[PDB]
């Protein structure tokens, strides 16, 4: 295998604010992606990583728009990881004062995978969305997106601040909308592409097993 990874990270204002018994949903997600980046920063896998930020007060993308394709920065292109990315993740990244849409960031990120997967080699591919569900959106392209996630052969992993066993009505309704999207992708296995920041910090605790064949 040679993989694609795309961290698609919500940096809007709201994820700075929390249930007081935990770190903020912003810094929780920032810590998860830190505890991840370290892994392939050491492990000699052939896997390309990209960073996309959304809820950004500026915008930087190949696809720029006025309302859609906006409050998004394609902060790092799809290549093998490095220590400067890990420093930028650990120390550089800021919340915007504004807000944005994960369906928005997803279409940009998936189109960037459709660019990058042509000019250099791959086998398996992923996109990875981290948010507090402060995205407000029209339920637009969804059937074409789920069809295209098959036609592009990319799986989506989705990351959230709360449990699957004090959350807002907006987080409850947002999760039922994420469920509906993964039921549409994969059915009963689809919800096992969904992870809490809680269980994942309680699972990304360690460096990788050494990978070797016989």
């Amino acid at each position: 295998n040679k993989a694609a990874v795309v961290l698609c990270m919500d940096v809007g204002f709201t994820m700075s604010n929390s249930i007081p018994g935990i770190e903020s949903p912003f810094e929780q997600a920032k810590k998860v992606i830190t505890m991840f980046v370290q892994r392939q920063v050491f492990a000699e896998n052939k896997d390309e990583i990209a960073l996309v930020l959304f809820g950004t007060d500026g915008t930087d993308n190949p696809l720029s728009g006025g309302d859609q394709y906006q409050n998004i920065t394609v902060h790092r292109h799809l290549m093998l990881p490095d220590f400067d990315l890990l420093e930028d993740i650990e120390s550089k990244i800021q919340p915007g004062s504004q807000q944005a849409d994960f369906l928005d960031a997803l279409i940009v990120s998936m189109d960037v995978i459709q660019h990058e997967t042509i000019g250099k080699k791959f086998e398996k591919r992923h996109i990875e969305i981290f948010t507090d569900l402060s995205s407000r959106f029209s339920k637009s392209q969804l059937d074409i997106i789920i069809h295209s996630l098959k036609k592009c052969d990319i799986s989506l992993q989705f990351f959230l601040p709360f449990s699957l066993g004090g959350i807002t009505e907006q987080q409850k309704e947002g999760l039922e909308i994420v469920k509906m999207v993964m039921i549409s992708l994969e059915g009963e296995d689809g919800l096992d592409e969904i992870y809490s920041f809680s269980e994942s910090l309680r699972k990304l605790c360690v460096f990788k097993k050494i990978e070797r064949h016989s």
Binding site: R39, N45, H126, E128, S155, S200, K208
Partner: peptide, 7 residues
């Protein structure tokens, strides 16, 4: 078996 973040 797991993949992605769980590679």
């Amino acid at each position: 078996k797991p993949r992605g973040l769980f590679s």
